[PDB]
Amino acid sequence: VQLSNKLIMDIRRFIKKYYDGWLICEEPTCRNRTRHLPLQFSRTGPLCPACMKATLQPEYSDKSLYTQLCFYRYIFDAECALEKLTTDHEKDKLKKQFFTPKVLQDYRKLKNTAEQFLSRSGYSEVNLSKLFA
Amino acid sequence: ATPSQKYNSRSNRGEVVTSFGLAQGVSWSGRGGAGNISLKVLGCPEALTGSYKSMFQKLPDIREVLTCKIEELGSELKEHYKIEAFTPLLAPAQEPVTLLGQIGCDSNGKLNNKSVILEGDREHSSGAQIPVDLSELKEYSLFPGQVVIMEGINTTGRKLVATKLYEGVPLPFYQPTEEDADFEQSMVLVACGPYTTSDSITYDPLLDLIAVINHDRPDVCILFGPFLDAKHEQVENCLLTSPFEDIFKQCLRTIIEGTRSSGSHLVFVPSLRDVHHEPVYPQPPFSYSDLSREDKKQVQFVSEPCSLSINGVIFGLTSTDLLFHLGAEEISSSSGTSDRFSRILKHILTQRSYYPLYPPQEDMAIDYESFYVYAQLPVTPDVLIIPSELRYFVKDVLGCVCVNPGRLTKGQVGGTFARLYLRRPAADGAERQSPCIAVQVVRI
Ligand SMILES: [Zn+2]
- DSSP state string for A61-97: -HHHHHHHHHHHHHHT-HHHHHTT-S-HHHHHHHHHH
* Kind of pairing between the strands at B220-224 and B186-191: parallel
Tell me which residue of A75, A112, A113, A82 sits closest to A98, measured CA to CA.
Answer: A82
Chain B hits for A38, Cβ within 8 Å: 127, 129
- Across the interface, of B57, B359, B365, the residue whose CB is closest to A16 is B365
Q: Do A12 and B66 touch (CB under 8 A)?
A: no
Beta-carbon pairs below 8 A across chains A and B: 84
Chain A hits for B55, Cβ within 8 Å: 15, 18, 65, 121-123
Cα–Cα distance for residue pair B129/B107, rounded to 1 Å: 13
CA of B303, closest CA in chain A: separation in Å? 17
Cα–Cα distance for residue pair A37/B359, rounded to 1 Å: 8
Residue A48 in marked binding region: yes
Neighbour-count burial for A100-129, b at 16+ CB within 10 Å, e otherwise: eeeeeeebeebbebbeebbeebeeeeeeee
Beta-carbon-side half-sphere exposure of residue A51 (alpha carbons within 13 Å): 14
Integer angstrom CA distances of residue B133 from B103, B151, B154: 12, 12, 10
Cα–Cα distance for residue pair B430/B425, rounded to 1 Å: 12
A48: CA distance to ligand 1 center in Å?
Answer: 5
Q: What is the resolution of this structure in A?
A: 3.6
Cα–Cα distance for residue pair B240/A49, rounded to 1 Å: 47
Residue at A16: amino acid letter: K
- What stretches of B232-387 adopt beta strand conformation (E)? 265-269, 299-301, 306-310, 313-317, 331-332, 383-385
Handedness of CA B68, B71, B74, B79 (dihedral sign): negative
Chain B hits for A16, Cβ within 8 Å: 279, 363, 365
Task: Say if CB B401 and CB B382 are below 8 A apart.
Answer: yes
SS3 call for B78 = helix
Chain B hits for A40, Cβ within 8 Å: 127-129
Q: Do A20 and B240 touch (CB under 8 A)?
A: no
What backbone phi and psi angles, to 5 degrees, belong to A89? Answer: -65, -45
Task: Say if CB B385 and CB B315 are below 8 A apart.
Answer: yes
Interface mutation vs chain A, best among B59, B241, B357, most A CBs within 10 Å: B59
Q: What share of chain A is helix, strand, coil (3-state, %, to 5)?
A: 55, 10, 40
Which DSSP state fits A30?
Answer: T
Longest dimension (CA), chain A: 64
Integer angstrom CA distances of residue B272 from A133, B72, B158, B279: 36, 28, 40, 6
- Concatenating the DSSP letter of every residue in B363-388 gives S--B-HHHHHHHSB-SSB-SEEE---
- Concatenating the DSSP letter of every residue in B172-231 gives PBP---TTGGG---EEEEEE-S--S-TT--S-HHHHHHHHHHHHH--SEEEEES-SSBTT
Q: Do A35 and B366 touch (CB under 8 A)?
A: no
Task: Say if CB B418 and CB B394 are below 8 A apart.
Answer: yes
* Kind of pairing between the strands at B147-154 and B383-385: unpaired
| CA end-to-end distance (rounded Å), chain B | 22
Task: Say if CB B313 and CB B330 are below 8 A apart.
Answer: no
Could you tell me which residues come within 8 angstroms of residue B276 by beta carbon, excluding any fewer than 6 positions away?
Answer: A8, B228, B244, B245, B247, B248
Three-state helix/strand/coil letters over B13-71: CCCEEEEECCCCCCCCCCCCCCCCCCEEECCCCCCCCCCCCCCCCCHHHHHHHHHHHHH
In the stretch 32-51 of chain A, residues with CB closer than 8 A to chain B read 34-41, 45-46
β-pair partners for B410: B413
Task: Say if CB B255 and CB A14 are below 8 A apart.
Answer: no
Burial class (CB in 10 A: 0-12, 13-18, 19+), B291: middle
The backbone region for B126, taken as left when phi is positive above 0, alpha when psi lies in -120 to 50, beta otherwise, is left
Integer angstrom CA distances of residue B153 from B99, B102, B128, B131, B163: 9, 17, 17, 12, 7
B240: CA distance to ligand 1 center in Å?
Answer: 46
| Chain centre distance of CA B27 | 29
Nearest CA in chain B to A113: B245
- What stretches of chain A adopt beta strand conformation (E)? 23-25, 33-34, 56-58
